[PDB]
Amino acid sequence: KVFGRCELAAAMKRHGLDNYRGYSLGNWVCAAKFESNFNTQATNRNTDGSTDYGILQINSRWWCNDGRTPGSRNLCNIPCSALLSSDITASVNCAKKIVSDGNGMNAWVAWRNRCKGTDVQAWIRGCRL
Ligand SMILES: [Pt+2]
Ligand SMILES: [Pt+2]
Numbered sequence: 662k663v664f665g666r667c668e669l670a671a672a673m674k675r676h677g678l679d680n681y682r683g684y685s686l687g688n689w690v691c692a693a694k695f696e697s698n699f700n701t702q703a704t705n706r707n708t709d710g711s712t713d714y715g716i717l718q719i720n721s722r723w724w725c726n727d728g729r730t731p732g733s734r735n736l737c738n739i740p741c742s743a744l745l746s747s748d749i750t751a752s753v754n755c756a757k758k759i760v761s762d763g764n765g766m767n768a769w770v771a772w773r774n775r776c777k778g779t780d781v782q783a784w785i786r787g788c789r790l
Pocket of ligand 1: 686
Protein backbone atom coordinates (compact mmCIF):
# COMPACT_ATOMS: atom_id res chain seq x y z
CA LYS A 662 0.00 0.00 0.00
CA VAL A 663 1.34 3.48 -0.90
CA PHE A 664 -0.11 5.92 1.71
CA GLY A 665 -0.94 9.51 1.08
CA ARG A 666 0.91 11.92 3.40
CA CYS A 667 -2.20 12.89 5.46
CA GLU A 668 -3.61 9.35 5.40
CA LEU A 669 -0.38 8.05 6.97
CA ALA A 670 -0.31 10.92 9.48
CA ALA A 671 -3.86 9.91 10.57
CA ALA A 672 -2.95 6.20 10.82
CA MET A 673 0.19 7.00 12.86
CA LYS A 674 -1.81 9.29 15.21
CA ARG A 675 -4.48 6.59 15.73
CA HIS A 676 -1.66 4.11 16.61
CA GLY A 677 -0.24 6.43 19.34
CA LEU A 678 2.88 7.86 17.57
CA ASP A 679 2.07 11.61 17.99
CA ASN A 680 4.60 12.79 20.67
CA TYR A 681 5.58 9.15 21.44
CA ARG A 682 8.87 9.59 23.45
CA GLY A 683 8.45 13.31 22.62
CA TYR A 684 8.62 12.83 18.81
CA SER A 685 5.87 14.92 17.17
CA LEU A 686 3.79 13.30 14.39
CA GLY A 687 5.68 15.26 11.67
CA ASN A 688 8.92 13.47 12.72
CA TRP A 689 7.34 10.04 12.03
CA VAL A 690 5.77 11.20 8.71
CA CYS A 691 9.10 12.73 7.56
CA ALA A 692 10.93 9.51 8.55
CA ALA A 693 8.43 7.33 6.61
CA LYS A 694 8.68 9.64 3.53
CA PHE A 695 12.49 9.34 3.27
CA GLU A 696 12.71 5.69 4.42
CA SER A 697 9.98 4.11 2.19
CA ASN A 698 8.27 6.92 0.18
CA PHE A 699 5.17 5.90 2.22
CA ASN A 700 5.21 2.39 0.59
CA THR A 701 4.44 -0.51 3.00
CA GLN A 702 6.09 -2.97 0.53
CA ALA A 703 9.51 -1.21 0.51
CA THR A 704 12.55 -3.48 1.09
CA ASN A 705 16.25 -2.52 0.88
CA ARG A 706 19.41 -4.59 1.50
CA ASN A 707 22.08 -3.21 3.94
CA THR A 708 25.86 -3.62 3.36
CA ASP A 709 26.07 -6.10 6.32
CA GLY A 710 23.61 -8.60 4.70
CA SER A 711 20.56 -7.49 6.72
CA THR A 712 17.46 -6.01 5.03
CA ASP A 713 15.13 -3.12 5.96
CA TYR A 714 11.38 -3.72 5.70
CA GLY A 715 8.22 -1.68 5.36
CA ILE A 716 7.08 1.87 5.76
CA LEU A 717 9.71 2.56 8.53
CA GLN A 718 12.48 0.33 7.07
CA ILE A 719 12.87 -1.82 10.20
CA ASN A 720 16.14 -3.83 9.87
CA SER A 721 16.48 -7.63 10.26
CA ARG A 722 19.91 -7.09 12.00
CA TRP A 723 18.01 -6.50 15.31
CA TRP A 724 14.26 -6.33 15.02
CA CYS A 725 12.73 -9.07 12.86
CA ASN A 726 13.39 -12.55 11.39
CA ASP A 727 13.72 -12.70 7.55
CA GLY A 728 15.29 -16.22 7.51
CA ARG A 729 18.53 -14.92 5.87
CA THR A 730 20.31 -12.59 8.35
CA PRO A 731 22.82 -14.77 10.28
CA GLY A 732 23.84 -13.73 13.82
CA SER A 733 20.94 -11.25 14.01
CA ARG A 734 18.21 -10.69 16.65
CA ASN A 735 14.38 -10.61 16.40
CA LEU A 736 13.60 -8.12 19.20
CA CYS A 737 10.09 -7.35 17.88
CA ASN A 738 9.41 -11.13 17.68
CA ILE A 739 7.97 -10.96 14.14
CA PRO A 740 8.71 -12.23 10.64
CA CYS A 741 10.05 -9.30 8.63
CA SER A 742 7.30 -9.96 6.04
CA ALA A 743 4.69 -8.87 8.72
CA LEU A 744 6.15 -5.36 8.33
CA LEU A 745 5.04 -5.16 4.64
CA SER A 746 1.28 -5.34 5.36
CA SER A 747 -1.16 -2.60 4.26
CA ASP A 748 -1.94 -2.52 8.04
CA ILE A 749 0.90 -0.55 9.75
CA THR A 750 0.17 -2.00 13.27
CA ALA A 751 3.25 -4.29 13.33
CA SER A 752 5.63 -1.54 12.05
CA VAL A 753 4.24 0.99 14.58
CA ASN A 754 4.49 -1.44 17.55
CA CYS A 755 8.05 -2.39 16.57
CA ALA A 756 8.96 1.32 16.00
CA LYS A 757 7.80 2.11 19.57
CA LYS A 758 10.25 -0.53 20.93
CA ILE A 759 13.08 0.82 18.68
CA VAL A 760 12.63 4.49 19.59
CA SER A 761 12.43 3.52 23.33
CA ASP A 762 15.78 1.68 23.37
CA GLY A 763 18.00 4.69 24.28
CA ASN A 764 18.89 6.14 20.81
CA GLY A 765 15.50 7.66 19.99
CA MET A 766 14.80 8.36 16.33
CA ASN A 767 18.58 8.38 15.54
CA ALA A 768 18.05 4.66 14.81
CA TRP A 769 16.53 5.85 11.44
CA VAL A 770 19.38 7.16 9.26
CA ALA A 771 16.93 9.04 6.99
CA TRP A 772 15.45 10.77 10.09
CA ARG A 773 18.86 11.88 11.38
CA ASN A 774 19.98 13.12 7.92
CA ARG A 775 16.71 14.59 6.47
CA CYS A 776 14.28 15.33 9.35
CA LYS A 777 16.22 16.08 12.55
CA GLY A 778 16.61 19.88 12.99
CA THR A 779 14.07 20.68 10.22
CA ASP A 780 10.52 22.11 10.39
CA VAL A 781 8.83 18.69 10.50
CA GLN A 782 5.39 20.31 11.25
CA ALA A 783 5.32 20.93 7.43
CA TRP A 784 4.76 17.14 6.99
CA ILE A 785 1.28 17.37 8.60
CA ARG A 786 0.29 20.85 7.25
CA GLY A 787 -3.32 20.70 5.81
CA CYS A 788 -4.12 17.27 7.35
CA ARG A 789 -7.39 16.56 9.23
CA LEU A 790 -6.09 15.00 12.53
PT1 LIG B 1 -0.20 16.55 17.47
PT1 LIG C 1 7.17 26.13 11.46
